Amino acid sequence: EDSEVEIEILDEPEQGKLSMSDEQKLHEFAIITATDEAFAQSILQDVDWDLKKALDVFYGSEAFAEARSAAVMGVMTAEDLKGFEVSVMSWNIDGLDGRSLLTRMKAVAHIVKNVNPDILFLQEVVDRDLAPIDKLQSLYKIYYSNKGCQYYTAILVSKMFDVEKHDVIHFQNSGMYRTLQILEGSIGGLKVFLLNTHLESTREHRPQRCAQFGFCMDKVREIIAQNPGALVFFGGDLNLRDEEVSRVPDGVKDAWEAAGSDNKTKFTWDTFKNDNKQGFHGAKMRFDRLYWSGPLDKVKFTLEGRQRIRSCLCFPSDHWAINATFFA
Amino acid sequence: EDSEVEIEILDEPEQGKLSMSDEQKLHEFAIITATDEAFAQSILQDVDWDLKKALDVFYGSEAFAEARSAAVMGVMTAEDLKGFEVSVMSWNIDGLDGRSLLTRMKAVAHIVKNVNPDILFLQEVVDRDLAPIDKLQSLYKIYYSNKGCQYYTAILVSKMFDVEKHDVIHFQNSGMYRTLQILEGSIGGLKVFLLNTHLESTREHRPQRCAQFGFCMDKVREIIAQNPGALVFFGGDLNLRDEEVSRVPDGVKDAWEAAGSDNKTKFTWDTFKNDNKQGFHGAKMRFDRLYWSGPLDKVKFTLEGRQRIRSCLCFPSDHWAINATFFA
């Protein structure tokens, strides 16, 4: 009635066709799609030889975009990125500890200068005795998440890093002024996003922390979806226990894990080894972490700030710093 | 051995807990997530009360981003877009038909001026007798896909439309010079993408056409993923039979379908009604189509160019023009 009516081809066989074997199906798929039987094999051995499905998969499924491109057609760029490295360092410097704060901050600046990372995340930065950190502005552009607060986070980037924008999202479920600090910029023609945070502290605050984390991973997903080819770095002091870590988006990896999960570099807050804080029993955690996405696939991972300061016999922080170098 | 060691809370109950009923599970989920039992209900009645799963879903699943945002936090913009309308017209003007080409083109320009669309897609534009179409530059910015070819497509936009870029992708599987024409720009503060194409003609070329279509839908998916809040319009003469249409991405809708699937406006190439071409038997198809994505959810859909020209007794084209108005 209101169905479409097909054009007549006068010299065409006057009857269409209408079950099938397997090779029959491979040939059929090959003819319909104008692809080969070898490629037909692939799809046909994944949906239990459901041909009618396999067509819909080839044309409509998101997995086969590549194939479709190849069928129709026959930013960086591997060879530019080979020979490129970028280092990211993250450190909770425990500014809330007033004991030897100045000496410790000087130690921090010294260590940063020695390690010389391109990108640095700091947590627990306080206004008091901040001078030696501010002195780093000769090497870095410094961005504070929330100056005027008891404590806050910071992102320091090499001067080659062009900064497009600086955003701070205040977690409303946080009773500790915690934020997500986002720096958007670039290194040469490579777009880079930096996400620094200090998730809610202590085991009890698991519900707040786990909510913040998945929320941060949502933001990461958006950035990746909207900026293909971009380098995305997210992390800091996440205060995570291993069973708290929820599903991370595809293409996102933990730096310490991708470096080979070395036990020697696992724990970033170790009461057995760092005596800045003392309990009756030792405690140790991988609180500080770094995730990334982008066109760099290899990573080297070390800990820093592990040497006792000599003038005051303590460590720069109760945290070890994490240092990851990404390359291709 | 190399497991994390948890901090001791001295005044904490010295034994964790360890099966469950349903209300027990709702309460448990509520306490762990710091959410309510009413919300717990939702997730818990979707994974057959699989609590351990439901946690992973709440924190890690992409569906619950909203919830997570609400848990952590507590561009256009509805009220700006109410009162906003945009019209898109698509017409295969059959420039390859030399019969009364000039008179027909004048009719085309006249009809375009009468309908006055903000955006116009043209297919089968030829160099010969192009003058009255070029005259439209007083009202429109005109972009030709492939001038210097036997025939090509065009996109005409209102002068309020700011054009950021113009791309033409040549289909390599095409023996008919077919392309995907992409115009990226904006109307005020609203980003707009326009995708115009003339997919491979005739039923036989189904494999080429169906490949081109899914490929075009891949490009649409990318644009949507990378530009949230943007208006995306894709279509033209797609030469589609109904059973050829593969899965369209979420958020993409057929304009004629969203307008209510009116039989009165269904067929755009009707040999029973348009005698510019004559066969022994009539034929009719919905060859010409328009899909869209974006913050406009309502659409009105009409056909144009349905009146016989009086000086030469033919229609401007063997195609009817499609005209869709999008609003909120």
DSSP state letters, B165-199: EEEEEEPTT-SS--EEEEEEEEETTEEEEEEEEEP
Tell me the catalytic residues of B: 237
Structure tokens at A58: 């080839």
CA distance B197 to B152: 9
CA distance A234 to A290: 6
Residues A56 and A77 in one domain: yes
Residues A100 and A246 in one domain: yes
Residues pairing with B143 in the sheet: B155
CB–CB of B34 and A207 under 8 A?
yes
Structure tokens at A240: 């995570």
Using alpha carbons, select from B162, B161, B138, B174 the residue that is nearest to residue B153.
B174
Spatial contact of A232 and A220, defined as CB atoms under 8 Å apart:
yes
Structure tokens at A69: 């491109």
Q: How many helices (H) and strands (E) does chain A have?
A: 9, 14
Residue that has been written with the tokens 């930065």 in this structure: A125
CA A279 to chain centre: 33
CA distance B256 to B242: 13
Residues 151-170 of A with CB under 8 A from B: 169
Residues pairing with A114 in the sheet: none
Give chain B's domain count.
Answer: 2
Method used to solve the structure: X-ray
CA distance A193 to A182: 7
Structure tokens at B202: 């005739």
Pairing state between β B119-125 and B85-92 = parallel
Residues A144 and A14 in one domain: no
Tell me the catalytic residues of A: 237
Cβ-based contacts of A280 with chain B (< 8 Å): 8
Spatial contact of B246 and B209, defined as CB atoms under 8 Å apart:
no
CA distance A108 to A91: 9
Spatial contact of A244 and A210, defined as CB atoms under 8 Å apart:
yes
Using alpha carbons, select from A169, A172, A191 the residue that is nearest to residue A180.
A169
Q: For Cα atoms B168, B170, B174, give the angle at the middle one, nearest 5 degrees.
A: 150
Residues pairing with B169 in the sheet: B180
Q: Which residues contact B107 (CB under 8 A, 6 or more apart)?
A: B305, B309, B316
A78 — phi, psi (to 5°)?
Answer: -60, -50
Residues B10 and B159 in one domain: no
Spatial contact of B319 and B237, defined as CB atoms under 8 Å apart:
yes
The upper half-sphere exposure of residue B216, i.e. CA atoms within 13 Å in the direction of its Cβ, equals 36
Cβ-based contacts of B221 with chain A (< 8 Å): 62
Assess whether the previous peptide bond of B325 is cis (omega < 30° from 0): no
CA distance A195 to A233: 6
Structure tokens at A7: 């054009």
Task: Identify the domain boundary among B55, B81, B107.
Answer: B81
Nearest CA in chain B to A261: B2
Q: For Cα atoms A314, A320, A323, give the angle at the middle one, nearest 5 degrees.
A: 140
Residues B167 and B196 in one domain: yes
B219 part of contact set with chain A, CB < 8 Å:
no
CA distance A267 to A301: 12
Nearest CA in chain A to B29: A207
For residue B228, the domain's CATH number is: 3.60.10.10
Residue that has been written with the tokens 């809708």 in this structure: B253
Residue that has been written with the tokens 């104008």 in this structure: A34
Residue that has been written with the tokens 């990851």 in this structure: A324
CA distance B249 to B186: 22
Residues A148 and A159 in one domain: yes
Spatial contact of A5 and B283, defined as CB atoms under 8 Å apart:
yes
B283 part of contact set with chain A, CB < 8 Å:
yes
Residues B288 and B314 in one domain: yes
CA distance B107 to B277: 18
Structure tokens at A184: 């958007």
Residues pairing with B300 in the sheet: B325
Name the E strands within B1-160: 85-92, 119-125, 140-144, 152-158
CB–CB of B213 and A4 under 8 A?
no
3-state DSSP call for residue A85?
strand
Selected residue of A1, A7, A11, A268 to mutate for chain B interface (largest B Cβ count, 10 A): A7
Q: How many helices (H) and strands (E) does chain B have?
A: 9, 14
Structure tokens at A170: 């205040």
Length of chain A: 328
Cβ-based contacts of B74 with chain A (< 8 Å): 172-173
Task: Identify the domain boundary among B81, B109, B138.
Answer: B81
The amino acid at residue A249 is P
CA distance A84 to A326: 8
CB–CB of B72 and A173 under 8 A?
yes
CA distance B157 to A205: 55
Using alpha carbons, select from A300, A58, A76 the residue that is nearest to residue B244.
A58
CA distance B99 to B313: 11
For residue B27, the domain's CATH number is: 1.10.8.10
CB–CB of A283 and B74 under 8 A?
no
Cβ-based contacts of A7 with chain B (< 8 Å): 202-203, 279, 283
SS (H, E, C) A159-199: CCEEEEEEEEEECCCCCCCCEEEEEEEEECCEEEEEEEEEC
Residues B238 and B133 in one domain: yes
CB–CB of B210 and A246 under 8 A?
no
Cβ-based contacts of B282 with chain A (< 8 Å): 5
A301 part of contact set with chain B, CB < 8 Å:
no
Structure letter (DSSP) for residue B14 = S
Give the CA-trace dihedral at B18, B19, B25, B31, to 10 degrees: 0
CB–CB of B218 and A68 under 8 A?
yes
CA distance B247 to A144: 47
Residues B194 and B311 in one domain: yes
Q: Which residues contact B242 (CB under 8 A, 6 or more apart)?
A: A4, B286
Q: Which residues contact A197 (CB under 8 A, 6 or more apart)?
A: A153, A178, A179, A180, A181, A212, A216, A234, A235, A236, A237, A238
Residues B200 and B117 in one domain: yes
CA distance B184 to B78: 23
Residues pairing with B316 in the sheet: none
Q: What is the resolution of this structure in A?
A: 2.5
Residues B315 and B275 in one domain: yes
Task: Identify the domain boundary among A37, A59, A81.
Answer: A81
Residues 237-276 of B with CB under 8 A from A: 241-242, 246-248, 263, 266-267
Give the CA-trace dihedral at A127, A98, A107, A316, to 10 degrees: -120
CA distances from A179 to A168, A265, B58, B77, B160 (A): 7, 27, 21, 26, 41
Spatial contact of A175 and A150, defined as CB atoms under 8 Å apart:
no
Pairing state between β B321-327 and B288-293 = unpaired
Residue that has been written with the tokens 């116009």 in this structure: B120
Sign of dihedral through CA atoms B48, B50, B51, B56? negative
CA distances from A45 to A37, A49, A53, B238 (A): 12, 6, 12, 31
Residues A97 and A190 in one domain: yes
Name the residue range of residue A107's domain: 82-328
Structure tokens at A272: 């057995």
Greatest pairwise CA separation for chain B in angstroms = 98
Give, to the nearest 10 degrees, the angle between helix A206-226 and helix B22-33. Answer: 70
Query: Residue B215: in which H helix or E strand, if any?
Result: helix B206-226
Structure letter (DSSP) for residue A276 = T
Using alpha carbons, select from A245, A270, A268, A266 the residue that is nearest to residue A256.
A266
Spatial contact of B307 and B64, defined as CB atoms under 8 Å apart:
no
CA distances from A170 to A180, A208, B68 (A): 7, 13, 14
